[PDB]
């Protein structure tokens, strides 16, 4: 006599799409329910198991000129410090050029980590000058445009010289926050105090002016890259991150 | 003291959580044949308020005669308690209600009954929750539910209106899809996704709008032909064993506990 | 340096259930001491709970008659309620305590002459008899009084009840009901005495008492 | 050939809300069905696993004045001994002030335990007098207002002196009952003999009068606290416990 | 068998006690064997298993909840609209079923009592309190009476954690009724 | 891939009242599905198993 | 917290540390919070020590989200005097930080 | 004879430069305890004399 029996619990025939424990297949079309072995052959041995592949590759977020006409202490460019920042756009073809860090971090609710800004000047050997890159911890809506140069040396800062053998200064922003995470708010419509994406703003001054002879270009363009280290993001979503104009 | 503070007086902790078990057990007489030295005290002094109160002679009250301990939190609140109820009046509509531990919210929008009571006992709450929704009335109705953490884009809460969002944005947060013919009930755990340490239940003004919201469960239904009868939903919250409760507060006055 | 003694202000005294918290208090002054007598004025055992409260008492006194039919109830008794009375020395213990749990022991005594004939069943029924059969009384703790054999029955029963103790002032329902039925009728010839006397002796066993209380009723 | 099979028992797709064995989730929204580690950090290391946290903290149930005009033997205040008792109310804001013991014990059908009344006088050092706190075991509807002072020394009692170095006398009521539990009857409408909440009434007399000089207040207010030890409650319910006026 | 009852209208509640008293004569009371068994002995202490069986109308959601004695409850053996909150109901614990999917329920009833046991043979005052085990209630919603009748029935059984004490005399043949 | 599967046998959702193997409860109202210990106390130590 | 009642006055106080706001819950129940009872008869000094309780990592001072602590002093039993006794008491509060950590240097002056 | 405890009246407390001499004083009431974070909200070095 067969006493094997069970009771049907709740959630009968509901589909949980949220996790691969409940999203995995219950059957197959494959004859004999067969498995596929690995084949690196034509793929160059490059296998991607993780999204940190794309966030460590520094990509071009923004670019600003450094003119010879900038008096000492003038803010040339201000950056909010969040992975969601890119100002680069293209004309033909029509597109909004998105970095690698911004394109991964746009798909997640919450992000924390260190953001590594890689600044690259494009001078000649005959230019000279200094830039000051200041990090001003706070939300991204704090109004930073009144800060003079002597006041901004209070905040954590770094000063790079234009003409040398090394082009790049890597500005690693430590994680400074009152919450263990920040949040992707650009999905939401208007601003809400207490809910912030960036950990601060990154100000760039003209520390010393730009000096140079007559026959060399009177300004130096500066690429700003962006990447991330010690990164943790979670809570998947879907969002198309729009170009951030200053 | 590390901070540089000094004193002669002995610093002694006050109101330690879980002094005793809430079930009768033995772990002879309790007090007697000596004196009630414990019957005179100075309640103002925290060193003397921890003196075990004893007055008359008494006996140890045996063992309690059922197994479980009903004064545990992970048992008492494990039972799932009422949250809300709502009814779709038309097809292809969405409804979004937050889980808001704030007491400034008065039901039907807010926590009623015991939940409103419990989340005001303590200051901080951190962890996952289990949620069960129960469906009444119309049958052959497919519906989708999805959990939205705070700060992310979501439709106006406590309001029934047509969807403002993509099917792509919805399914990305993860979603169940059920049919009210086959199941008639759902039980699903809600993750703890927050940029905050915890979510406090007693707050006012500005901090009340952000820190007090656990997350927003939404429900969308399609293929509802209103030639049929009403379609009712109801929600019941329970607490997992991964939730944690911190820093007891004072319980609510009898005028602040409402019902639904 | 020398220390000069002084009164100890705060002290706590008391006895049984009572307590005294005094700020100004002072040591107690004994005189004499408890003595034992070489010659006892009263040789009987000194009274206590077990001497007073647990002794036998005359509860009910009835008569079993020839005109009582079969299954006639000779005596119906609420046992504990009759033990709570001014007459019986158990009172002074019960009158001042709220709750008690206890046993019961019944002794029922008839005195038929050998020229009479008949029987009795005396059963201890918890609560009330309610409905169930009179024929089946032998299920309860009982004894059968037979004019031929025994004129004495004895019964001993524990505390059966739905609560912790029987509250005497406002009793919920009677713990025990003692019922005496004519098990087979009394029959006599000519001139034999037409009756028998019947008496009942009840007492508590293992009596516990709780809840001292000023309530006089 | 697949012989795995079962029979569907009764109660198919019924939801038992009554216990966390049948109320626990059957799925999750959490990606990879992940678990959360413990984080005491910002919570002060105070974690609450049990409701006995709130019942051992003595709170203010009631307060009564002790006048110099009270003749010896007058009942100043009578308390039923049940965890459900509080008389404290507030005016602005409008509220009914509920103790901690009454607020936990209102949610349970049955309660047993020891209730520790903490009395605190507020005298000066120049007042003098004695109070007698009597416990009169019975239901809470017994009529106790006819009991003189000499009769109430029969019941278990305690006498505290007003002026001393210690303010408080803790009156621990032993459990005295005919039933292993008492019951929360305040949900039900009218009274039913045999079904009781309190284990008795607690009478307070004026044992000796209140004596005092001319320039000190002629009365002494006395707080009455309430707490519980050896507490056992069970059978959850929901009830909003109303203020108990004498 | 224990009882049977029928809802005649939507959104109504029905509450019947489990009363071991024999003063209660069926249809309100214990019938047949239960009325017989609980009169064999004086005391009963422990949990019980209860099964309810649903007949007639389909697509009907309903909630049941067990109320211990002394706590607030609606008038027993009577079909009337609910006097209580959905919050007070669900706090005692409740199943919620649909008569489309299940058509039957089996659920254990806890032993919650301020009493040692519950006696089946008692009279007068003590009969109203000590003899009631607890009150099972059933509420149904979404019952459109264009449909046929909706019948319920209840059947009691005894767990292995119940205990029976102090045998009494069995009932006379005039006191055993049937339903 | 989840290959756990079963087939629904006959007698789907039929109630056998006839034996305590099929009449025992499938759930409870008791919080934490608790069990009750034995208590002979007020019953005189007389327990009836048969 | 420090009062200075003369022994010819009488009364009490409860001084409790309340995180966030008092919100609603009972005034009677303040003894749940870390507290102390100022009694004109016994002590004129109370002391309280509490860790950091808050829903975030740290309290941002420029634009504070909500107050971390609220200290509330209630009349626990009224002040009573005879004739001529001073009609009041002075009350003062001394607060300090323990285990203070600091982050985020910053030029923002406000 | 048994001794019944009582408040210790006179005590001296304070921190850094400050001092409190109280006649009526009473023991201090702690709650909780200092906790360390498993996950640091701010990874930079905590401010001090040498940082500022």
PDB file of N, CA and C in Angstrom, chain A residues 83-84 86 98-111 184 186-187 233 235-242, chain B residues 152 169:
ATOM      1  N   UNK A  83      30.396  57.140 -10.258  1.00  0.00           N
ATOM      2  CA  UNK A  83      30.684  56.379 -11.469  1.00  0.00           C
ATOM      3  C   UNK A  83      29.800  56.747 -12.638  1.00  0.00           C
ATOM      4  N   UNK A  84      28.723  57.488 -12.415  1.00  0.00           N
ATOM      5  CA  UNK A  84      27.750  57.773 -13.455  1.00  0.00           C
ATOM      6  C   UNK A  84      28.140  58.942 -14.340  1.00  0.00           C
ATOM      7  N   UNK A  86      29.840  61.004 -17.269  1.00  0.00           N
ATOM      8  CA  UNK A  86      30.573  61.181 -18.516  1.00  0.00           C
ATOM      9  C   UNK A  86      30.002  62.384 -19.250  1.00  0.00           C
ATOM     10  N   UNK A  98      29.580  56.907 -23.782  1.00  0.00           N
ATOM     11  CA  UNK A  98      29.504  56.533 -22.381  1.00  0.00           C
ATOM     12  C   UNK A  98      30.754  55.760 -22.008  1.00  0.00           C
ATOM     13  N   UNK A  99      31.289  56.038 -20.824  1.00  0.00           N
ATOM     14  CA  UNK A  99      32.490  55.351 -20.393  1.00  0.00           C
ATOM     15  C   UNK A  99      32.180  53.888 -20.118  1.00  0.00           C
ATOM     16  N   UNK A 100      33.207  53.145 -19.715  1.00  0.00           N
ATOM     17  CA  UNK A 100      32.991  51.760 -19.319  1.00  0.00           C
ATOM     18  C   UNK A 100      32.470  51.682 -17.895  1.00  0.00           C
ATOM     19  N   UNK A 101      32.991  52.528 -17.010  1.00  0.00           N
ATOM     20  CA  UNK A 101      32.519  52.494 -15.636  1.00  0.00           C
ATOM     21  C   UNK A 101      31.076  52.959 -15.554  1.00  0.00           C
ATOM     22  N   UNK A 102      30.723  54.000 -16.302  1.00  0.00           N
ATOM     23  CA  UNK A 102      29.353  54.489 -16.254  1.00  0.00           C
ATOM     24  C   UNK A 102      28.386  53.507 -16.882  1.00  0.00           C
ATOM     25  N   UNK A 103      28.851  52.687 -17.816  1.00  0.00           N
ATOM     26  CA  UNK A 103      27.938  51.778 -18.491  1.00  0.00           C
ATOM     27  C   UNK A 103      27.648  50.532 -17.677  1.00  0.00           C
ATOM     28  N   UNK A 104      28.560  50.129 -16.798  1.00  0.00           N
ATOM     29  CA  UNK A 104      28.262  49.046 -15.869  1.00  0.00           C
ATOM     30  C   UNK A 104      27.509  49.567 -14.658  1.00  0.00           C
ATOM     31  N   UNK A 105      27.930  50.712 -14.123  1.00  0.00           N
ATOM     32  CA  UNK A 105      27.331  51.189 -12.886  1.00  0.00           C
ATOM     33  C   UNK A 105      25.950  51.772 -13.108  1.00  0.00           C
ATOM     34  N   UNK A 106      25.521  51.941 -14.359  1.00  0.00           N
ATOM     35  CA  UNK A 106      24.167  52.439 -14.576  1.00  0.00           C
ATOM     36  C   UNK A 106      23.118  51.366 -14.351  1.00  0.00           C
ATOM     37  N   UNK A 107      23.512  50.101 -14.314  1.00  0.00           N
ATOM     38  CA  UNK A 107      22.578  48.990 -14.235  1.00  0.00           C
ATOM     39  C   UNK A 107      22.329  48.540 -12.807  1.00  0.00           C
ATOM     40  N   UNK A 108      22.910  49.220 -11.825  1.00  0.00           N
ATOM     41  CA  UNK A 108      22.839  48.820 -10.432  1.00  0.00           C
ATOM     42  C   UNK A 108      22.276  49.942  -9.582  1.00  0.00           C
ATOM     43  N   UNK A 109      21.492  49.555  -8.581  1.00  0.00           N
ATOM     44  CA  UNK A 109      20.948  50.533  -7.654  1.00  0.00           C
ATOM     45  C   UNK A 109      22.039  51.216  -6.851  1.00  0.00           C
ATOM     46  N   UNK A 110      22.895  50.445  -6.197  1.00  0.00           N
ATOM     47  CA  UNK A 110      23.785  50.992  -5.196  1.00  0.00           C
ATOM     48  C   UNK A 110      25.221  50.723  -5.607  1.00  0.00           C
ATOM     49  N   UNK A 111      26.094  51.689  -5.338  1.00  0.00           N
ATOM     50  CA  UNK A 111      27.496  51.557  -5.696  1.00  0.00           C
ATOM     51  C   UNK A 111      28.334  52.073  -4.543  1.00  0.00           C
ATOM     52  N   UNK A 184      21.533  54.891  -7.071  1.00  0.00           N
ATOM     53  CA  UNK A 184      21.328  55.431  -8.409  1.00  0.00           C
ATOM     54  C   UNK A 184      19.983  56.144  -8.413  1.00  0.00           C
ATOM     55  N   UNK A 186      19.236  58.714 -10.563  1.00  0.00           N
ATOM     56  CA  UNK A 186      18.888  59.300 -11.844  1.00  0.00           C
ATOM     57  C   UNK A 186      17.664  58.648 -12.452  1.00  0.00           C
ATOM     58  N   UNK A 187      17.257  57.492 -11.938  1.00  0.00           N
ATOM     59  CA  UNK A 187      15.977  56.929 -12.332  1.00  0.00           C
ATOM     60  C   UNK A 187      14.831  57.791 -11.820  1.00  0.00           C
ATOM     61  N   UNK A 233      29.012  46.907  -6.205  1.00  0.00           N
ATOM     62  CA  UNK A 233      27.705  47.366  -6.631  1.00  0.00           C
ATOM     63  C   UNK A 233      26.730  46.214  -6.483  1.00  0.00           C
ATOM     64  N   UNK A 235      22.117  45.078  -6.326  1.00  0.00           N
ATOM     65  CA  UNK A 235      20.711  45.338  -6.606  1.00  0.00           C
ATOM     66  C   UNK A 235      20.455  45.708  -8.058  1.00  0.00           C
ATOM     67  N   UNK A 236      20.485  44.745  -8.975  1.00  0.00           N
ATOM     68  CA  UNK A 236      20.314  45.057 -10.397  1.00  0.00           C
ATOM     69  C   UNK A 236      19.055  45.851 -10.700  1.00  0.00           C
ATOM     70  N   UNK A 237      19.163  46.703 -11.716  1.00  0.00           N
ATOM     71  CA  UNK A 237      18.022  47.355 -12.352  1.00  0.00           C
ATOM     72  C   UNK A 237      18.376  47.605 -13.811  1.00  0.00           C
ATOM     73  N   UNK A 238      17.551  48.400 -14.486  1.00  0.00           N
ATOM     74  CA  UNK A 238      17.825  48.821 -15.850  1.00  0.00           C
ATOM     75  C   UNK A 238      17.608  50.318 -15.983  1.00  0.00           C
ATOM     76  N   UNK A 239      18.637  51.020 -16.446  1.00  0.00           N
ATOM     77  CA  UNK A 239      18.553  52.456 -16.666  1.00  0.00           C
ATOM     78  C   UNK A 239      19.494  52.871 -17.786  1.00  0.00           C
ATOM     79  N   UNK A 240      19.082  53.822 -18.620  1.00  0.00           N
ATOM     80  CA  UNK A 240      19.960  54.330 -19.663  1.00  0.00           C
ATOM     81  C   UNK A 240      20.507  55.679 -19.232  1.00  0.00           C
ATOM     82  N   UNK A 241      21.784  55.712 -18.869  1.00  0.00           N
ATOM     83  CA  UNK A 241      22.358  56.882 -18.223  1.00  0.00           C
ATOM     84  C   UNK A 241      22.616  57.977 -19.247  1.00  0.00           C
ATOM     85  N   UNK A 242      22.005  59.136 -19.030  1.00  0.00           N
ATOM     86  CA  UNK A 242      22.063  60.274 -19.927  1.00  0.00           C
ATOM     87  C   UNK A 242      23.334  61.096 -19.698  1.00  0.00           C
TER      88      UNK A 242
ATOM     89  N   UNK B 152      15.051  54.664  -5.857  1.00  0.00           N
ATOM     90  CA  UNK B 152      14.904  54.351  -7.264  1.00  0.00           C
ATOM     91  C   UNK B 152      13.516  54.752  -7.755  1.00  0.00           C
ATOM     92  N   UNK B 169      12.045  47.964 -17.498  1.00  0.00           N
ATOM     93  CA  UNK B 169      12.463  48.463 -16.195  1.00  0.00           C
ATOM     94  C   UNK B 169      11.844  47.642 -15.075  1.00  0.00           C
TER      95      UNK B 169
END
